[PDB]
Amino acid sequence: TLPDTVDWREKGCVTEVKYQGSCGACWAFSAVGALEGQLKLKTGKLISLSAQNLVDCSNEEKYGNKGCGGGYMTEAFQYIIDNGGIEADASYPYKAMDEKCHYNSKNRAATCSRYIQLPFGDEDALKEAVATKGPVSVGIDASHSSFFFYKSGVYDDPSCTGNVNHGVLVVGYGTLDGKDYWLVKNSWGLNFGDQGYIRMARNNKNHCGIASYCSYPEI
């Protein structure tokens, strides 16, 4: 049986909530968050990895990422594979701007060997990954004003669609007052949601397309 409740924060696998600013780098934060979880599970050490490294160095047609113009978590993972590593946020800090790539292999802090995508729209498969693998990068439809009015409980706006536009991190799941949810880490600072987190409806027919583009890296 899978556990009825999972929270990777309680296992020390989730870093502090970040603030992406005006730069559309949610995809890079999602990607590093997933890798951070893996790095902790492999090494026992929890370290913020460099979203800026992704923004600066994967901004090319090769990857189809566009720095602050947006990108894809799986292509971030591919960049890390191709590049042989990624720096920590400490040596490559977040500027919220597209800049020249200055990755340096001597500050490598994590690697990626491969990544895994889950089947489109499969909430059961996302539950399994989250319970057995770690935090999972997902795309959601976060285009509705209600997403940002949310403060507590479980977000289940009927205006939500399956057309995803933002990368976030699922760090757990459970059931709150009878409503199944996904525990989502965003990258809009602590004043977003509930200290940077939002519970989104789970098992409601792929609500906000949360199960539509799920991935996680393997160290």
Ligand X SMILES: *C(=N)CNC(=O)[C@@H]1C[C@@H](S(=O)(=O)c2ccccc2)C[C@H]1C(=O)N1CCOCC1
Identity of the residue, 43 or 161, whose beta carbon is nearer to ligand X in the bound complex: 161
| Residue 72 lies near ligand X (rule: CB under 6 A) | yes
Catalytic residue among 166, 206, 208, 214: 166
According to CB under 6 A, which one of 48, 117, 165, 204 is a site residue for ligand X? Answer: 165
Identity of the residue, 40 or 49, whose beta carbon is nearer to ligand X in the bound complex: 49
| Residue 164 lies near ligand X (rule: CB under 6 A) | yes
| Residue 24 lies near ligand X (rule: CB under 6 A) | yes
| Residue 37 lies near ligand X (rule: CB under 6 A) | no
According to CB under 6 A, which one of 167, 172, 196, 217 is a site residue for ligand X? Answer: 167
Contacts of 158 (CB under 8 A, 6+ apart): none
| Residue 70 lies near ligand X (rule: CB under 6 A) | yes
Catalytic residue among 53, 65, 186, 206: 186
Question: How would DSSP label each residue in the chain?
Answer: ---S-EEGGGGT--PPPPB-TTS--HHHHHHHHHHHHHHHHHHS----B-HHHHHHHS-STTTT--GGG---HHHHHHHHHHHT-EEBTTTS---SS-------GGGEEE--SEEEEPPTT-HHHHHHHHHHT--EEEEE---SHHHHH--SS-B--TT--S---EEEEEEEEEEETTEEEEEEE-SB-TTTTBTTEEEEE-SSSSGGGTTSS-EEEE-
| Residue 27 lies near ligand X (rule: CB under 6 A) | yes
Nearest Cα neighbor of 59 from 27, 34, 90, 37 is: 27
Window 85-124: residues binding ligand X (CB under 6 A): none
Applying CB under 6 A, which part among 37-45, 103-111, 112-120, 162-170 lies near ligand X? 162-170
Residue type, 197: Y
Is 186 noted as a catalytic residue in this protein? yes
| Residue 26 lies near ligand X (rule: CB under 6 A) | yes
Smallest distance, Å, CB 80 to ligand X? Answer: 17
**So which residues are the catalytic ones?**
26, 166, 186
Using CB under 6 A as the criterion, which residues of the chain lie in contact with ligand X when the complex forms? 20, 24-27, 66, 69-72, 139, 164-167, 213
